[model samples]
Target: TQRYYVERPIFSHPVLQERLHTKDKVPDSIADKLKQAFTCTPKKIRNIIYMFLPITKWLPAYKFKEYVLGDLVSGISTGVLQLPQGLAFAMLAAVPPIFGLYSSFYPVIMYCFLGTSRHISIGPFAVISLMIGGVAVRLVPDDIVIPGGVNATNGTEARDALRVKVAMSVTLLSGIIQFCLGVCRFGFVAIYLTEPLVRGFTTAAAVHVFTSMLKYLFGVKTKRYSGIFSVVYSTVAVLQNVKNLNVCSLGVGLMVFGLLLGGKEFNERFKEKLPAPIPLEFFAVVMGTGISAGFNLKESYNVDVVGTLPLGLLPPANPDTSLFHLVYVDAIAIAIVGFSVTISMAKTLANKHGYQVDGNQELIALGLCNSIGSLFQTFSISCSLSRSLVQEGTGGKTQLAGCLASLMILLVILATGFLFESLPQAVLSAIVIVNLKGMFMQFSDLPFFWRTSKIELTIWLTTFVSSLFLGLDYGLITAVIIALLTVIYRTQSPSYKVLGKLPETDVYIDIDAYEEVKEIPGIKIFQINAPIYYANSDLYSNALKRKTGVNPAVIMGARRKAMRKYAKVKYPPIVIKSTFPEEMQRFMPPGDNVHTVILDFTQVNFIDSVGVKTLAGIVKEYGDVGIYVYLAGCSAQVVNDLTRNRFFENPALWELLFHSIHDAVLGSQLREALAEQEAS
Candidate 1:
């Protein structure tokens, strides 16, 4: 026979660390922690640049000929898709339609230089557009004049310039926030824009967009609604003026919608066979503009039209930075919403293409794009859904697709800037409605969240209604609060269970979940799945009382009754038995109860002061009831907290703690057996 001596450390290899055994005191200052966190050097300098600029790696290895042709087509398709979307969403943001083209171009081109997603086309997105519009409309009234210096000749132009400044201020501030977040390595914030919150927000904003466009579609001039009960009064005012609907605008809107819808279906159904999407959004915009211009539609039909548009970019002038103080909180929401949407779109594309995207790098790229686009007077931008999907199927092979698409937008601005001017606002409104296909489809997800979690359903409802009524900024805050409360509620009162030992094994499991496990006699074992803390201390006590039915009042009352039973009468060994019907030893005792209550603390890694006091109270109370409170399987932290609270100071309590529940049960049984044998 071979014998093996298994030598091992008495405690553990990891226990002898410098932090635990050394005389060095843990740093209390924040700067001390920061000193240990980052080291500066030549290599670190290179790493930092590489961390922010992903283009440095991929661009030098570019394969142009193989990817260019496909990108050209992709660029062509996306640019066309981007064109009408840019026009439509501009109204959503309450800006002139031309700036939409600039937003599509500037941000996409800028992001291409740094973006890790490689091919996602960045542009003015729906949610961000609606959010910007809400802030802009509330703050900068259309008739707002320079108090002492109103432009007496061109007051509307001054107001328009002011609108541009206000809109750009939000974009600038949001970009700064995003850039700072990336630099601070806090890009993980994108993960916080959870699915329930984002989807609900997007859908509610779609309603906001839908309601806003009715003013254009019905061609009714109602007073712009803002402040108190704005959404409700806005709807009512629109209804009051619906009787004055311009028939021509409605006709054109219906025609454009039907054409765009049919074309979208045709493209999706036969995209594999077709060279490109039907390009109906562009076709609709072009034909609407041409027909309006040829027939002098605005003058003849009294329908509203996009008037003389500004051509070319305004040399980057500083927007009022004072907006920093006014819209700072809204900026945070915009940054998160835009970046989260971009990251989600990028991850999906990366997965489909069997590639990995650095999320932090994506954050830096987006931050830089938005930050730089702010200088060029662009609003907050994100990945456009339709253009991204269209670009992928149109044979894009690299980020160059975005560059080419941007170039196309610039050319549209330079060559045919005024061609889209006569484009009816109603047609743009219809295009906006038709493009919301995916967001509208999200209503189907209502039943899905309902089945999974009613609380989550509540979040969706609260966010949606609040955004519609209280507005997007307030609604976002409300949603986040509800989400946090739900988390805390679950933590404060987790479930507890009675665990029993399996036959012939040390393993313990819930008796209700597994009927095969058997409980030990005179021992009750309870297991709490979460850490013991002040939040759940009372819950733990009440649950223990209910499950074991062994409170101080109940158990001690029985003991007193049993003691008094023999107080009035004494029994002689033989005569009392003779008077009894059966032998005295054959009769059962009038009262017997559990001697040991074993608490399994395998899951309790932490314990607070309230919890420690409760344990002490429970121990002494149970002792008075002729039961012992025994704690087993406590972690090092739990032991430490208990010790600090004087749990192990008393000799009686010092004997009640054990390393394992199995050992505690066996030892308790053996001591009882010995006491019984000695008495007999």
Candidate 2:
């Protein structure tokens, strides 16, 4: 009901105007027609439709009076959230904090025009942030070394420049990968990361993020570490080396945390009493920074603060063009990880709200956002779940909310660039540390996975361990590979059981488990369950041989020859005995239990060439002993394949293909076999 009407006009919206001017050269007549069509649509329908086709509704409703207010509020709130988040994300990626803000600015504006999810707020996300950092550390330069000309030593400026260049290159490459994936519609790649794996990976990464920030949190320079285990080990090793615990910094962090937690609790307990509280994320960050600056704690306790952020808007430039070769590989990996986070968050929110999200379109939107944002000197970016939840929870009705948020951020950057510089790094670290707690806290999943599926638990544990030691990207990729392998392994060698019919209900069930079902007298039926392939083609043969002993007719012939040779042994109403003892009887005599082997293949869906060959071989082996082999309930496709392979050419094999297993088993031909055996 709320999707169709344009509360705003397209021409009045900057994003839509830019996009339309760049791509859509709609004639005046066509544009007039579009406006007329919207005029007849109901307001609610317009809003609902515009949520999907955002451009169609909002662009036409953009009125000057309403636009400015909505834009201002949305922009300011979003700006507050982005400032700390962007910087924190940059720190996670091991890039300068400035890049994080840059990443925030352009992408939000780009996605506002192109993105489909009306509530999806695009920016930095925790998991993607860690992934970028992990990948960059592995693939890009961790520290830049300036090469001195002749005898001159390398300076800090050169090293800093090199690091920035590498970071920029990585960002550009990641953007390209996202653009390509979006173009090819490879959004389904996200499905492979199941909920359990995603949770495990996030948890592991969170541990890494929190631990890495500990050095800054206490203002202590301990041993350098990166991987999960190494970070833990290092932290333990430097337990006594924590020099400045920075009570002031800790106080500021705790205060911010308290205010945020208190506000949230209060809102929940007294929803009616409170005028809807300011967004906790924005309020907490801004108030925390304000308190820390107000106290001038940085000078007092040697508190590390985000110093000298580049002022004004980012200039239009390519990300480190010279480092293209090195950045491409790292960027591609980062893009894949970031894209997964964005699409997954979008789909999850869309599903909760009872809407369908077009993944390919989402990819295109993200790709364009990154591509354009990169040109404006932004780092890698993604959709932020926390921000989206905040926006939606706060009753944001349109993308205008996001546009407003971006504008607010821009104004903040312009006006208070100096203010942000004074905020303590420990406070930021504490914020990230607390955020990291949710990333790796999946202990509840352990019991659930163990009770539901031990195999999946194995996968979860494997992924967790790998990510801890190897790195986030490797860990995730390994888990995905293992998950796929588990599927293939389970299917390749599937389980099978012999079945029998229940007398009371006439319903078939597994013979081994249900004692009521009777086995056929002197005949053996083996049922194979899995699709027959090279992996387990010999299982059928082994099962048949194990179940059935030698044929009765052969044993009878052996007894007759033994009786002729030793008539005296058969004298006193006696049984005719073989020349050799039972232990050596295999060479002299045979048992009289098994006569024929019938294979039931009704459960089998498909069979490969090797499976067919194995079945054909079994028929020939039994035929040599005068034992008949009967094949029943072969699927049409299986029959065709077997026939094409000339399996029916053998006279020893009796093949009876039927629509159902019951029909084949109850046929007159099987009854005749029983009658013939009795007479013989």
Candidate 3:
């Protein structure tokens, strides 16, 4: 095989060329020299520009006719979906409906130019919406009224303003965290959240999203809550108070749900028979919103509507300085959740498209988008699954589609601000419910989980239950902690099996299962799978002593049975001829009783200072107990670690080091013991 080198310019840093070289026939010295010559100079200014405005780089590369046409098609389709979803997300945040549109603007454009994923549509997402709503309800006091046509409250408007500011601050902070993570190439950190955990969390989030929308659906006011428990509680309370439900709101909510589901079914069954070319799914949402608005369900039946949204774009607003402390705590959690979800979605799309997606670049893009969006009065934005899927389905070749979608949203805010004023809250709630339905319990996948790793499935369920009953942020953190602990557990206590060489195959196999492979007398080969540590150090030493004890009577009995079974044996097995009982009674030399104990180190690839110390302790303990400890097939790194720890300093231990099991067995005093036993 031959290796070739390819050089390509990194778009973010084009001034200096980035080279990808491979080493095949190249000498080590030459490869080292080449690596030394490749210097990484920092492009601070270019990085700043990239962080603030990613679109500056790619906008020039786009073809006017082809790119613009593709962008427009994707933009319009995504825009239509964003309109309803944005409002629903905003409602989830308990912010004015217009802010949903406001949140939808700048983030997408920023991500399009800088982001690595071509189809990742950044905007208000269901989980983020719920997170914002939860935070707002906590910080902002409820509305109260006073006499003389005056509304007196614990600063509802001021608190709303503060909530927005805090959210923006958190969004900005989240960007900083994500940007740092990307720069450090910490994208692999997301691997801690395994598939089972993600599935469980998403399903739980769906339940939370659906339950949270029950108030808007039925037009019933219940106690404000944040966690899944609160959502469940409010939902139950709403059900009990169904007598006070607004008839028009209920009818509109039911109609919206029915239309969304019915349209999905109709589109699948009769797309060929349909006269209109428009996607029935999008039409269902649009028509449902239109029908609810036209009938004046909000005013006629006392249903809540997103009253007149502010026209045009929002003025630049700074995060609230007063809530800086709270924002810091919330920002850390938000950043983690946002990064995890976005990266997961992007990677899935990237794998499907057959291209290498840089996780670090994606992180920087997202961080910049949200941080920059904060200055424009936007809340935290993330990759929306629906919008991204639509963009991919519509042949979006680049991030330009996201930029166009942002522009389209901005245009809608300017031109059709009043159109959504009469849109029923129940319809928006139904939209949310429909979106969340997919997140509910995936019972079908449960069987697959059972067939796979059951231990991981338990961990998944634990995380799900914790997240549901506790908080999303808490659940995620806890799951990560549990995952780390599981790793440590496996590393500290690995599986061990005694191996014997089979005569027919001349290959080593576990002695317990394969009876054909005879064990060598006065020789014990123990395979320790995990790295030696303080937790299992004493256990390993004790197990070794027990297995290598002097047992002449037991050894002879076992050999007699073997001879009777085989018949016509030239000599009894080594176990039978060894004078173990006589040697023990006469207080023979410590090394004489246990001729050899080979510790297989094939599986151990690494050893830290503590691990080395544990191994050293084992060697010392066994030496004190009159047993020889021989190491076999240790990896280079482990060998280096052992040498660095001065394991070779002890003469007794130094005499036991062997490169391989065969070398250790054949070139040791055990050879003489086995020869004598064969002569007997």
**Number of the top-ranking candidate, with TM-score as the measure:** 1
**TM-scores for the candidates:** 0.81, 0.73, 0.77
Residue-level error in angstroms, candidate 3, position 652: 3.1
Position 558, candidate 1: lDDT:
47
Q: Tell me each candidate's RMSD, in Å, in order.
A: 6.8, 14.7, 10.3
Decide which is better by lDDT, 1 or 3: 1
Consecutive 10-residue window with the lowest summed lDDT within model 2: 569-578
Question: Per-model C-alpha lDDT, please?
Answer: 0.74, 0.64, 0.68
lDDT of 1 by residue, 1-680 (tens): 99545442222112222226647896589887788567788888777676666667677778887777887888887787787778767767777777777888888877887888876778988667867777787677766656646446753655556667777899988888887877777766545545677667666766765776677777887776644356677789989999999999989998888988898888889978986556576788888888788887888998788766667776776767888888887788888767766776666567679986676776677777777777787888887755676677678878888888789789888787777778888887787677767456768768999999987887777767766786655676677677777766766767788878998777888878879998887889988887768888888888888787567676545445545654554422210111222333233255335778888887886888899988888877776545767787777788789888877665445556666777678767876888799979
The global Cα lDDT (0 to 1) of model 1 is 0.74
Best by lDDT: 1
* Candidate 1, poorest ten consecutive residues by summed lDDT: 571-580
Better of 2 and 3 by lDDT: 3
Residue 113, candidate 1: C-alpha displacement in angstroms:
2.4
Residue 637's C-alpha lDDT in candidate 2? 78
Model 3 per-residue lDDT at 297:
61
Query: How many pairs of residues collide in model 3?
Result: 0
Which stretches in model 3 have alpha-carbon errors above 4 Å? 1-77, 134-139, 143-188, 227-243, 268-282, 318-326, 356-359, 389-397, 437-445, 504-506, 513-516, 538-595, 607-628, 668-670, 673-680
lDDT-better candidate, 1 vs 2:
1
